[PDB]
Write a protein that binds this DNA or RNA. Structure first.
Ligand code: NA
Ligand code: NA
Ligand SMILES: [Zn+2]
Ligand SMILES: [Zn+2]
Ligand SMILES: [Zn+2]
Length: 327
DNA sequence: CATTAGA
DNA sequence: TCTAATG
């Protein structure tokens, strides 16, 4: 956690680089498991050979481990870090919609900068166009203060549209968080569950309302259950317009709402921990349900959930407010 | 690990 | 159809 820190950090840098700059899923996979185990190792690694005894650590990494222990650096790391091509890919990739694949491509053609991106907006698809457009605004955290206004809006419209809608804003924001990255709204409705062969309109009506009053300003991807756009609080009385925010809305079969809400609310750690617990308690938890375990090794039969409670009850835990879902 | 664009 | 990108 701090004993194997640089080691695991160097390893991750290395890993990540294989994967993006080059396309060596293998090495890239190498560094990762390695970085994974040395991370667990409960002792201060004092040398390569010592490391080496680890599962996943072979001679290559061992060597890196030595150089790094020996001199506080690494050559390949120094080299990479400097490498303009690689720097370039790492950067382009920051545009929402630009992944490694495309990043490499552009570079190839020679678009290495944000400005390059501009004169070449033609080479870019819709998503990427929007990502380019709100590059600054997207990089910005969302102050909770704003979160409350946004939530405020979405709730009112949702409701005006149909009163049968149930929406919950998940994420860190749900957990108390001072700021958040984007708004996640989980939605479900009664007339829509596991069976009841869809009802696309259900998601669409709402998106439509939202855009209607100018909350949603762009569509990154809209399908029949997941809408991915951009929103913005009305830039009030001039002098201060708001930053364009990322928003995601998902439609859920009402019969698997709370599992989902449970899930998305996190945190990753509360999850895993909540999940690990369900197991002893003789169950299984996932993004959509909770099924009792059966001795034959496994089992199914999706238990009926009416609120975040029932799930707790099931695994017979203490209801933990979202606020304290931290781990 | 699942959903959407796109070519 | 696959393969990318977001989560
Ligand atoms: Na080994
Ligand atoms: Na990106
Ligand atoms: Zn020790
Ligand atoms: Zn989020
Ligand atoms: Zn999100």
């Amino acid at each position: 956690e701090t004993l194997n820190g640089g080691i695991t950090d160097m390893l991750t840098e290395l890993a990540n680089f294989e994967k993006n700059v080059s396309q060596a899923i293998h090495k890239y996979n190498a560094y990762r498991k390695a970085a994974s185990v040395i991370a667990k190792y409960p002792h201060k690694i004092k040398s390569g050979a010592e490391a080496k005894k680890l599962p996943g650590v072979g001679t290559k990494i061992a060597e890196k481990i030595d150089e790094f222990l020996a001199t506080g650096k690494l050559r390949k790391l120094e080299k990479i870090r400097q490498d303009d091509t690689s720097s370039s890919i790492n950067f382009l990739t920051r545009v929402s919609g630009i992944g490694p694949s495309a990043a490499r491509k552009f570079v190839d053609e020679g678009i290495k900068t944000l400005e390059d991106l501009r004169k070449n907006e033609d080479k870019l698809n819709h998503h990427q166009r929007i990502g380019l457009k709100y590059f600054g605004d997207f990089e910005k955290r969302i102050p909770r203060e704003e979160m409350l206004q946004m939530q405020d809006i979405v709730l009112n419209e949702v409701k005006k549209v149909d009163s049968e809608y149930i929406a919950t804003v998940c994420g860190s924001f749900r957990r108390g968080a001072e700021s958040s990255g984007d708004m996640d709204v989980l939605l479900t409705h009664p007339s829509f569950t596991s069976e009841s062969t869809k009802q696309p309109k259900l998601l669409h009506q709402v998106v439509e309302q939202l855009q209607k009053v100018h909350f949603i300003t762009d569509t990154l991807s809209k399908g029949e259950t997941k809408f991915m756009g951009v929103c913005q609080l009305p830039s009030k009385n001039d002098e201060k317009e708001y930053p364009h925010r990322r928003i995601d809305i998902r439609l859920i079969p009402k019969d698997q709402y709370y599992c989902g809400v449970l899930y998305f609310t996190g945190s990753d750690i509360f999850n895993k921990n909540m999940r690990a617990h369900a197991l002893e308690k003789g169950f299984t938890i996932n993004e959509y349900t909770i099924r009792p375990l059966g001795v034959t090794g496994v089992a199914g039969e999706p238990l009926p959930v009416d609120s975040e409670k029932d799930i707790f009850d099931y695994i017979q835990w203490k209801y933990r407010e979202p606020k304290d879902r931290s781990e």
